[PDB]
Design a protein. Structure first.
Lengths: 213, 62, 136, 356, 75, 191
RNA sequence: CCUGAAGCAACCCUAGGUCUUCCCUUUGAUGUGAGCUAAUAAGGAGUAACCGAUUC
């Protein structure tokens, strides 16, 4: 006999400065009744927002994961967690009569963040090609995959997390790999399928509030 | 919703369980270009008028 | 009961997890986080017979109660996360998926962005039923 | 319609989907401020004219005044008295049922102070009647052909100006309102009456509304003439075949082919407040004879019934009009041009110097 | 359930209604007058034949199946 | 009268079918202008020959039903004549115009039916043809006047006048409009 | 043969009230009550009940 939504404060969510539309939406919490605190229970919530909604209007097939690493006051401050292509996109790309080449590198930014990036690329059929197949030999596949790893590491390793997200907002890494592997075997549908977050540095606030303007 | 006139342009085929509904290609008197497919009871002729309660819904062609 | 968003234009988004098995339907609205639940009306809470828990009808009732319940708290629009059973089992959503998604659009909500979130395994554990399948 | 010069600045662009979604409720009644001209009595005995018992379509010499907002002396008087949006029926009929537009058309907006003179270009093809505009294929013929869009439109305009007068008992005592026609035995049967519309968003609208004739039963008539030239190529059914079993079919088929013309004519009558709009079914002698015509039949429709029948929405008509009067009562003075994209479905708005 | 008991002969006030009312109706038929005065079709016919011969209602058509009168014109 | 053919004593001209859709399948004007409802027929010869029968004859045909009254067109013609007299008294319009309006107002727009993905079954909504509209319009207001007159003082001619007046109005009091709105409602309930 | 009846905004004529309001009385409208009808309304509900795989 207790209306359970009487004790619920709404909180506005904020995305970092790297995206056009700042505020993502609203978040529910329980009023600080007893020892457990609203903001502390609210800290560490993962928001999966499509880049179309995160920007004004663009590709809707790339999604960004954002963690409310701190709350300032009636305002959740999210920070880049991870990235994932949508099921519809990945399922649509993977089709028969070609070679699918998959790479993954475990690379660290200049600041603490250590990512795991997964790249994918499919062998392109030539404009005058009459052969049905368009397969790549095993040595051509692993020369492509070696080059995938070599770019994916170089692009992240040398600069910080604000700039790696600025690269993932387009697909500058996928376009760079695609143009690089034109000599070995022409690929076409090349993306960075997924970005994972393995390690974060011990939390700072001054470093967060540079990312939040 | 406003009631709108669809004009039969070409009778296609007969449908239903007991062959009871005539499935007909209609050309809208309102919009110049929009042509949809509708299941119709009773006997219908090439080049006459229907009063559709909705001018958006479409019947499954066979 | 007060989402302090603007009365004119501002849409408050939830996200509705429509888990549609072949013998049950779930309609479950949460935060964009996905942590805090708002509604969960199953196919089986509405109808009282075991054979029609996985009905288009039961899913239509469930989505209607969810739509009405979330309109009061002030969730205007919804993102959609459809799924079948997945794992070793079927990956075609249940027959309640269509009727539920339709029902909370007939009931005056707004539809954001839709996607399949079925647990598709890399390669899985051994499926239930013998080497010779389910013989009937 | 016009060749667009490099000095002409595009300011606003509106496409047909965006214009189709518009609405305005609350539009008030039209108030007859002035009623001018003299209108004849109609012979209801031209309706014993069917597929078997037709009539000769004769040339009648009666003078038609194609005077715009610019050259209207009553509007020129009323300008200073009250009103800030002045128009003719043909002009606002174009803007209202703009959604169906196929060919290139144009309207000169003249914002002199806090006014909108929705004017038309004299000595431009605005008072032509288009033919088979909205067919599966418009006539793809050349200017030297007789079945060309120009030549079909020429004769279509002629037979309409003929029919309006021919059907009429045009030498039996006329119905006079208050004034003689403000433009001048020699004259044609037409009455111009001016109406105020108070328009919600803070606009007063003074449009010139034209009745064609009077009929007894009294009753006001807007009268037009439907053309059938060469059906078999024209992408329509024959009229002379029977027309009696298929009247509803012959109507609805010629409607789709002339979607914008019949939409302009019907909203023309709704504007004027005519309780009945009549028609005239005119065809050739032989399918390639431009000179001869014979009147097959006529059918009468109450424009309120006809507009909900064919297709229109008063909310759309007034919703598109409030949008355009709001746009050009928002932006600056001088000569403008509402021109529709010749090949694509979108109306454009250019700002031009004081000359053209 | 319910039953209908019409009059075989006029009550004073029912005849007062008939003498005042039925020449005001646009349609005068024995069936209409039978329902409108709670009177048998025999009484209705006999009463309307009085009203006509008296010279008060304008008859339009007679037939064994259907006899129709109207209220007489004004001017 | 070599010019105008008054139906008994009712004018042919100055009756307009407003609805464009039902205009071809309603015969009242200019060539179907005949003195009597009665005629030879041959309207059951080919498919859409029926559309050319004067609507007054179509009403005269549909009226004579329920076994005991199969083929009594003379009795039915006198009923339609008496009904047209009574319509003119209570209304004051052209009785042919009131009939035409009642035909338009009574005809449904949508009806429910059984369709396919054959295996199981499904009851979806479909359109009615402009002939089916006028066919069912006549039948509805005929059976409405019929069943109203059964075990009643109100004579068949009066019951027909009641139905045609109230249906031409669009009352929901005539059996015609009542049943029309029931079918269009069910048609909506499963569309 | 008699049935209603007391002031008329102010001057002149006129008829001893040659006079038109209390209200008797009838027609046209609006609102409530009652009947028939809406209607088998709708909703309850394509829910409950009953039947369904299987054995030839």
């Amino acid at each position: 006999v207790v209306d359970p939504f009487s004790k619920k404060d709404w909180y506005d969510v904020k995305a970092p400065a790297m995206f056009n539309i700042r505020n993502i939406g609203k978040t529910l919490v329980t009023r600080t009744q007893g020892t457990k605190i609203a903001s502390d229970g609210l800290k560490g919530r993962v928001f999966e927002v499509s880049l179309a909604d995160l920007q004004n209007d663009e590709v809707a097939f790339r999604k960004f994961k954002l963690i409310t690493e701190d709350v300032q006051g009636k305002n959740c401050l999210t920070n880049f967690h991870g990235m994932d292509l949508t099921r519809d996109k990945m399922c649509s790309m993977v089709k028969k009569w070609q070679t699918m080449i998959e790479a993954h590198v475990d690379v660290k930014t200049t600041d603490g963040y250590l990512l795991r990036l997964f790249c994918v690329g499919f062998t392109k059929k030539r404009n005058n090609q009459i052969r049905k197949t368009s397969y790549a030999q095993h040595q051509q596949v692993r020369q492509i995959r070696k080059k995938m790893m070599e770019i994916m590491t170089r692009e992240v390793q040398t600069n910080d997390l604000k700039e790696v997200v600025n690269k993932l907002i387009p697909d500058s890494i996928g376009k760079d790999i695609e143009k690089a592997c034109q000599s070995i075997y022409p690929l076409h549908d090349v993306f960075v399928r997924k970005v994972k977050m393995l390690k974060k540095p011990k939390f700072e606030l001054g470093k967060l509030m540079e990312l939040h303007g | 919703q406003p009631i709108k006139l669809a004009r039969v342009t070409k009778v296609l085929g007969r449908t239903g369980s007991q062959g009871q509904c005539t499935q007909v290609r209609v050309e809208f008197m309102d919009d110049t270009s929009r042509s949809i497919i509708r299941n119709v009871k009773g006997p219908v002729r090439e080049g006459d008028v229907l009063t559709l309660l909705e001018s958006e819904r479409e019947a499954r062609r066979l | 009961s007060l989402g302090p968003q603007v009365a004119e234009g501002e849409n408050v988004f939830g996200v509705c997890h429509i888990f549609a098995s072949f013998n049950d339907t779930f309609v479950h609205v949460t935060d964009l986080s996905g942590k805090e639940t708002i509604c969960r009306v199953t196919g089986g809470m509405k109808v009282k017979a075991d054979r029609d828990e996985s009905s288009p009808y039961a899913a239509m009732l469930a989505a209607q109660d969810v739509a009405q319940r979330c309109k009061e708290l002030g969730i205007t629009a919804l993102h959609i996360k459809l799924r079948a059973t997945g794992g070793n089992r079927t990956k075609t959503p249940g027959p309640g998926a269509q009727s539920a998604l339709r029902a909370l659009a007939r009931s005056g909500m707004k539809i954001g962005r839709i996607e399949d979130v079925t647990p598709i395994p890399s390669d899985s554990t051994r499926r239930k039923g013998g080497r010779r399948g389910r013989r009937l | 319609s016009v060749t667009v010069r490099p000095d002409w600045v595009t300011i606003e662009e509106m496409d047909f989907p965006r214009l189709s979604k518009l609405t305005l409720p609350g539009v008030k009644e039209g108030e007859d401020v002035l009623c001018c001209g003299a209108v004849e009595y109609y012979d209801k005995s031209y309706d014993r004219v069917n597929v078997k018992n037709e009539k000769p379509l004769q040339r009648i010499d009666r003078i038609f005044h194609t005077v715009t907002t610019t050259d209207d002396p009553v509007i020129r008087k009323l300008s200073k008295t009250e009103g800030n949006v002045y128009a003719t029926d043909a002009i606002l009929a174009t803007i209202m049922c703009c959604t169906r537009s196929n060919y290139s058309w144009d309207i000169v907006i003249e914002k002199i102070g806090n006014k909108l003179f929705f004017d038309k270009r004299d000595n431009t093809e605005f008072d032509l009647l288009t033919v088979n505009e909205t067919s599966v294929e418009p006539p793809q013929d050349d200017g030297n052909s007789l079945n060309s869009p120009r030549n079909l439109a020429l004769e279509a305009t002629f037979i309409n100006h003929n029919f309006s007068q021919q059907v009429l008992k045009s030498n039996e005592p006329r119905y006079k309102f208050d004034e003689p026609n403000p433009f001048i035995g020699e004259v044609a049967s037409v009455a111009y009456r001016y109406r105020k519309w108070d328009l919600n968003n803070g606009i007063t609208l003074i449009a010139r509304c034209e009745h064609d004739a009077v009929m007894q039963g009294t009753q006001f008539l807007t009268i037009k003439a439907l053309n059938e030239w060469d059906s078999k190529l024209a992408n329509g059914v024959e009229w002379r075949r029977k027309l009696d079993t298929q009247r509803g079919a012959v109507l609805a088929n010629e409607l789709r082919n002339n979607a914008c013309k019949l939409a302009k004519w019907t909203v023309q009558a709704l504007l004027a407040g005519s309780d009945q709009l009549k028609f005239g079914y005119v065809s050739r002698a032989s399918v390639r004879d431009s000179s001869k015509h014979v009147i097959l039949e006529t059918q009468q429709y109450k424009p309120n019934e006809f507009a909900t029948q064919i297709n229109l929405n008063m909310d759309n008509a007034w919703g598109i009009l409030r949008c355009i009067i709001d746009i050009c009562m928002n932006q600056k003075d001088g000569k403008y041009l509402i021109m529709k994209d010749p090949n694509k479905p979108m109306i454009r708005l250019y700002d031009i110097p004081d000359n053209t | 359930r319910d039953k209908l008991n019409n009059l075989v002969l006029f009550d004073k006030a029912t005849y007062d209604k008939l003498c005042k009312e039925v020449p005001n109706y646009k349609l005068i038929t024995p069936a209409v007058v039978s329902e409108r005065l709670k009177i048998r079709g025999s009484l209705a016919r006999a009463a309307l034949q009085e009203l006509l011969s008296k010279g008060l209602i304008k008859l339009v058509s007679k037939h064994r199946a259907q006899v129709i009168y109207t209220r007489n014109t004004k001017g | 009268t070599p010019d105008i053919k008054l139906f008994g004593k009712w004018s042919t001209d100055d009756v307009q079918i407003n609805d464009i859709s039902l205009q071809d399948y309603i015969a009242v004007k200019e060539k179907y202008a005949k003195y009597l409802p009665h005629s030879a027929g041959r309207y059951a010869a080919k498919r859409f020959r029926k559309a050319q029968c004067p609507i007054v004859e179509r009403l005269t045909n549909s009226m004579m039903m329920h076994g005991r009254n199969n083929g009594k067109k003379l009795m039915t013609v006198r009923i339609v004549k008496h009904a047209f007299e009574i319509i003119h008294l209570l209304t004051g319009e052209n009785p042919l115009q009131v009939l035409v309006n009642a035909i338009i107002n009574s005809g449904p727009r949508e009806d429910s039916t059984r369709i396919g993905r054959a295996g199981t079954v499904r009851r979806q909504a479909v359109d009615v043809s402009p002939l089916r509209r006028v066919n069912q319009a006549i039948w509805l207001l005929c059976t409405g006047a019929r069943e109203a007159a059964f075990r009643n003082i109100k004579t068949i001619a009066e019951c027909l006048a009641d139905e045609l007046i109230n249906a031409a109005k669009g009352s929901s009091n005539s059996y015609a409009i009542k049943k029309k709105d029931e079918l269009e409602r069910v048609a909506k309930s499963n569309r």
